[PDB]
Design a binder for this molecule. Structure first.
Ligand SMILES: [Cl-]
Ligand SMILES: [Fe+3]
Length: 318
C-alpha cells in the first residue's frame, strides 16, 4: 500500500526518510508538495474525497489553522505521546511536532556583547532605539511569538511592550528571516529576531558570502533565567478522511524513531524533539538552552489576537 503525504516541509534529503519508512513498513510515500496555507485549502476543497493521509507543515500556528479548518483527526499513540514532549504536541492530539526551532536574538558580534541581552521583554527598552530589524507582521513566526507574549502578559501589557519594540525598528520590516541576519551583519541593525536554523543554514552554505555573514552574527537564546526560550515546531497530523489511517499513524510513529529524528531535523538544521537524539554538528556550538514549557497550541489559539495587536501598534504587514 501507500500513504499520501501533503507537505510544505519536504527537503530532498527527506527522500532517504521515505525510503527507510518503505523498507520498514512496505508502504510507499506519495508526496504532494505545496505551501502550507495552500495545502490546507487544497485538502479542504478535496472534501470527503481527499486522498491526503498526512499533512505536514511548519509552525504550530499553521497546524492550529489546519485543525480549525477541520482537516485533521485525533490520534492516540503511546509512541507519539511518550517520545514527543507534551508542549510540542496538540493537547487534543490533532497534530504533533517532529523537529524544533527557536525564535532567537541574532546579534552583530562587533556591536553587541551577549551580556547586553536577556529577554524578549528587554527588546522594548529605549536603549535599542534605531537598532532592531525584524520581518513583517504577516509572518507566522512573528505571529506565534507575539501570541506567546499575549498569553504571558495579557493584551494591555503586551501592547505596551509592542509599542516600545516597534519604536525600536531600525527600518521598516523588509525581507525574510535570512534578510534580517544579513542586515544585522551589515550594521543596518545591531539585533534582529529570526529562527535558529537560518543562521545554521548560512554557516553550512557553500557560498563564501553566506559564510562571512554567519561569522558576523551570534545567536542568543532569550529568557534563560526565567521561563525559557520560545520554541516552535515542524509538524504534522493525520488528515480527517485519510484513506490509509493505519499507514498514516505508522508514518508519524516512524518519524519519532532516532534515525528519522536525525534525518528530518538535520534536513533543515532544526533540533530533534525526541530526548536523547544527538543534535546537528552545526547547532552544537551554540549550546543547550532552556525551552519554555508553554504548549505550542497557544500560539495558534492567540494568532488572531497577535494580528490585532500588531496592527494596533503599526507593525507593518508584507
Ligand atoms: Cl500552556
Ligand atoms: Fe522557515
Amino acid at each position: 500500500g501507500a500513504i499520501n503525504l501533503y507537505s510544505s516541509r519536504h527537503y530532498d534529503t527527506d527522500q532517504a526518510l521515505y525510503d527507510s519508512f518503505t523498507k520498514k513498513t512496505g508502504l510507499k510515500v506519495n508526496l504532494i508538495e505545496g505551501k502550507g496555507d495552500k495545502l490546507i485549502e487544497r485538502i479542504k476543497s478535496e472534501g470527503a474525497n481527499s486522498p491526503a493521509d498526512v499533512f505536514m507543515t511548519v509552525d504550530a500556528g499553521r497546524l492550529w489553522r489546519a485543525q480549525e479548518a477541520g482537516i485533521l483527526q485525533p490520534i492516540s499513540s503511546s509512541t507519539l505521546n511518550n517520545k514527543i514532549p507534551a508542549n510540542l504536541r496538540s493537547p487534543e492530539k490533532l497534530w504533533f511536532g517532529f523537529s524544533k526551532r527557536a525564535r532567537v536574538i541574532m546579534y552583530n558580534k562587533n556591536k553587541v556583547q551577549p551580556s547586553e541581552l536577556s529577554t524578549y521583554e528587554d527588546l522594548a527598552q529605549n536603549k535599542w532605539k534605531g537598532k532592531i530589524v525584524i520581518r513583517s507582521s504577516s509572518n507566522i513566526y512573528n505571529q506565534s511569538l507575539i501570541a506567546s507574549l499575549i498569553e504571558i502578559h495579557g493584551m494591555s501589557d503586551a501592547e505596551g511592550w509592542a509599542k516600545g519594540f516597534v519604536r525600536n525598528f531600525a527600518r521598516p520590516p523588509e525581507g525574510n528571516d535570512t534578510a534580517q541576519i544579513k542586515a544585522v551583519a551589515a550594521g543596518i541593525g545591531d539585533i534582529g529576531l529570526a529562527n535558529s536554523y537560518y543562521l545554521a543554514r548560512l554557516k553550512r552554505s557553500s557560498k563564501p558570502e553566506d559564510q562571512a555573514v554567519a561569522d558576523k552574527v551570534g545567536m542568543f537564546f532569550p529568557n534563560q533565567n526565567g521561563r525559557g526560550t520560545h520554541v516552535n515546531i515542524s509538524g504534522g497530523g493525520v488528515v480527517k478522511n485519510a484513506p490509509n489511517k493505519e499507514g498514516a499513524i505508522k508514518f508519524l510513529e516512524y518519524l519519532v524513531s532516532p534515525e528519522a529524528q536525525k534525518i528530518f531535523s538535520e534536513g533543515n538544521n532544526e533540533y530533534p524533539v525526541v530526548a536523547g537524539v544527538p543534535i546537528a554538528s552545526v547547532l552544537k556550538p551554540f549550546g543547550s538552552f532552556k525551552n519554555d514549557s508553554t504548549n505550542v497550541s497557544v500560539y495558534g489559539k492567540l494568532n488572531a489576537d497577535a494580528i490585532k495587536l500588531m496592527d494596533r501598534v503599526g507593525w507593518k504587514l508584507e
